[PDB]
Amino acid sequence: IVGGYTCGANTVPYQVSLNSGYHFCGGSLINSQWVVSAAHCYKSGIQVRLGEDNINVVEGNEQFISASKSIVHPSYNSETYNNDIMLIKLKSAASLNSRVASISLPTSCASAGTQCLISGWGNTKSSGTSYPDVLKCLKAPILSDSSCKSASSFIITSNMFCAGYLEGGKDACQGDSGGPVVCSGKLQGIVSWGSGCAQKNKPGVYTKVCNYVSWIKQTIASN
Ligand SMILES: N=C(N)c1ccc(C[C@H]2CCCC[C@H](Cc3ccc(C(=N)N)cc3)C2=O)cc1
Ligand SMILES: [Ca+2]
């Protein structure tokens, strides 16, 4: 997260850290047994870390649970990143409490202008490298497709939306991938891709979750 602020320990209880010996992607807890992340975060041997703030220090509220199954969207396209969404099932149900909770799925899509909260342990520099140990937060509005496309020249699909600031300075970044984009109390997006970080006219691109609710529900019910 570039240009954000420190969230505060466990103030974003649905945020998870995917770990393979180190943090490599974010994710969101949708119920006691499932996590949603980005398909481009796919990897074998994943451990899901819940209730985390500082990812380098055991503070007491963490829950470390291995993934039993990973399901990448059947139509994920690694060339365009269309359908960049993946589901992960935990080997054992997580214990839900005030510091570890699920985030609700959308009943309807969000509209341009809506304010959202993006969070992650990704790079905090637009130029250079600096990874934080504590969770970072950023409030960003969803941009109209027209404003996003005309300014960035990005190839976007109906399964994506941009959010951020065209003037640059505030944006998600590498390391934030798979993380949540919550607006009006619902999970409306997943950190998917972008060009560099916080660059002018290059806003972040996010997977449009409201388009996958049916798939998510059916998948978790059958697995
Ligand atoms: N044409 C495409 N769809 C496309 C273009 C570039 C990349 C590379 C890469 C680089 C590899 C790691 C994944 C990644 C992560 C990332 C996430 C958010 C942001 C941001 N909001 N500024 C930037 C980068 C990304 O977009 C992937 C896909
Ligand atoms: Ca910790």
Side-chain angles (χ1 to χ4, degrees), residues 133-193:
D133 299 309
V134 294
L135 190 65
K136 295 293 182 184
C137 277
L138 176 68
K139 294 187 183 64
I142 294 178
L143 304 175
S144 70
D145 292 347
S146 60
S147 60
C148 183
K149 297 162 66 169
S150 69
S152 69
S153 291
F154 282 171
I155 291 298
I156 298 301
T157 68
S158 66
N159 296 309
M160 310 169 189
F161 68 81
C162 318
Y165 306 75
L166 297 182
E167 59 267 52
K170 298 177 183 176
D171 191 10
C173 200
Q174 290 190 290
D176 288 323
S177 291
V181 178
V182 175
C183 332
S184 301
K186 309 292 182 181
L187 176 69
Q188 295 283 185
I190 293 172
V191 182
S192 186
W193 62 280

Side-chain angles (χ1 to χ4, degrees), residues 6-127:
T6 305
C7 311
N10 308 294
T11 58
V12 186
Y14 50 79
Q15 171 85 226
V16 324
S17 168
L18 299 187
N19 185 292
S20 61
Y22 45 89
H23 166 86
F24 70 89
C25 272
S28 305
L29 188 63
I30 53 175
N31 70 38
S32 67
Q33 300 175 297
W34 296 87
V35 172
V36 176
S37 189
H40 79 265
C41 285
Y42 168 79
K43 177 186 299 182
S44 184
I46 292 180
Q47 178 181 259
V48 181
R49 304 201 151 193
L50 312 176
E52 285 274 29
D53 183 46
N54 187 312
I55 53 179
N56 279 319
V57 185
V58 175
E59 300 181 287
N61 294 295
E62 305 94 334
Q63 285 181 52
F64 296 167
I65 306 167
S66 295
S68 60
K69 177 185 288 185
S70 286
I71 304 171
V72 169
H73 193 279
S75 296
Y76 171 61
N77 185 310
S78 65
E79 176 177 60
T80 59
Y81 270 36
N82 196 200
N83 305 122
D84 187 15
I85 182 167
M86 167 183 83
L87 290 168
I88 303 169
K89 192 180 179 183
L90 308 179
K91 282 188 181 179
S92 60
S95 182
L96 299 184
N97 52 244
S98 57
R99 300 169 185 289
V100 176
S102 56
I103 180 65
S104 302
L105 290 173
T107 56
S108 49
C109 299
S111 63
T114 298
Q115 292 293 165
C116 308
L117 178 62
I118 304 173
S119 48
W121 289 276
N123 187 20
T124 62
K125 299 296 186 179
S126 59
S127 301

